[PDB]
Amino acid sequence: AGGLEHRQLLDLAQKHFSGLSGTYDEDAVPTLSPCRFTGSQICHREDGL
């Protein structure tokens, strides 16, 4: 973001990022599992504060 043409950013991308692995592993693609929310409570009692 700033004073720059989108063209030059794409050129620099193909110039300095083409050397990057775009081929994932056979079955090692990470997938985010949903995270269980839990109604709960945590109380760190510290009266010195």
């Binding site: 839990t38 109604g39 409570q41 109380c43 510290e46 010195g48």
Partner: protein
């Protein structure tokens, strides 16, 4: 009357609690509860029981004796 925030001093103690809609109200009621009743009974039976056993024997003897004394004996 005392109030919360003025009771006592506590430091470095963490408490983890779970919501009541997230857990069972009767978790392992018989699978865990019956063993605990037997543990507590054993721990206190010798303090509570012998007095009332002593009462039961004095109760029955006094009633038996009172019954026999009211029956007459040949002269």
């Amino acid at each position: 009357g005392r109030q919360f925030g003025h009771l006592t001093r506590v430091r470095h103690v963490i408490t983890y609690s779970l919501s009541p809609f997230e857990q069972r109200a009767f978790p392992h009621y018989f699978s865990k509860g019956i063993p605990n009743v037997l543990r507590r009974t054993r721990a206190c039976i010798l303090r509570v029981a012998p007095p009332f056993v002593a009462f039961y024997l004095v109760y029955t003897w006094g009633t038996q004796e009172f019954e026999k004394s009211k029956r007459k004996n040949p002269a």
